């Protein structure tokens, strides 16, 4: 009766691609990712390097910080 759709921007790139965004960096809309690729949405940047490819994800949302009593 309800279905969900989280928006995530994922770029699968070759290992030799030049990445111009740092890991855990916050980028805005239209931020250049590679020489020919620009980000469509803004958020946190996560770069995962695999054996032959680089997986880059852009996570939209609000960044929150835990408290001492935060039982998350």
């Amino acid at each position: 009766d309800r279905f969900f759709f989280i928006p995530e921007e994922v770029h699968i790139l070759p290992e030799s691609s030049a990445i111009m965004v740092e890991n855990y960096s916050i980028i805005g809309v239209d931020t250049r990712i590679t020489l020919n690729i620009r980000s469509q949405v803004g958020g946190l940047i996560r770069v995962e390097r695999k054996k032959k490819r680089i997986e880059l994800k852009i996570f939209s949302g609000d960044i929150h910080f835990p408290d001492k009593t935060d039982k998350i």
């Binding site: 965004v21 740092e22 916050i26 910080f65 835990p66 408290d67």
Partner: protein, 109 residues
């Protein structure tokens, strides 16, 4: 080899602190919750944020939440109103400006 973050730039900290203080003064004045303690809260806000930028901030990936946690605690310890609200306003401005301004200041992508 543990990655070594770039050293904090005192000149960048001074420029960002002035921008942070101006935004806090304009933002906190619009709320009646702070009343007559706007200047004191902003002054306490300016001090902690300036200290973090001078000593610990080294660019993207170093914007810690601890100074903003200290923001709510210090105001609450001094019995100043709007502790969490002032810290929330400060952390929202930092998320939108601090990392971007460091890249412009240093010329790094």
């Amino acid at each position: 080899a543990e990655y070594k973050f770039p050293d904090p730039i005192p000149e960048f900290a001074e420029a960002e602190t002035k921008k942070f203080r101006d935004h806090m003064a304009k933002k906190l004045a619009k709320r009646d919750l702070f009343e007559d303690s706007v200047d004191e809260i902003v002054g306490v806000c300016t001090e902690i944020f300036e200290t973090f930028l001078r000593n610990e901030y080294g660019g993207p990936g170093t914007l810690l939440v601890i100074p903003f946690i200290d923001m709510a605690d210090t105001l609450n310890e001094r019995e100043l109103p709007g502790g969490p609200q002032a810290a929330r306003a400060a952390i929202k401005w930092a998320q939108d400006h601090v990392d971007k301004d460091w890249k412009e200041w240093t010329g790094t992508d």
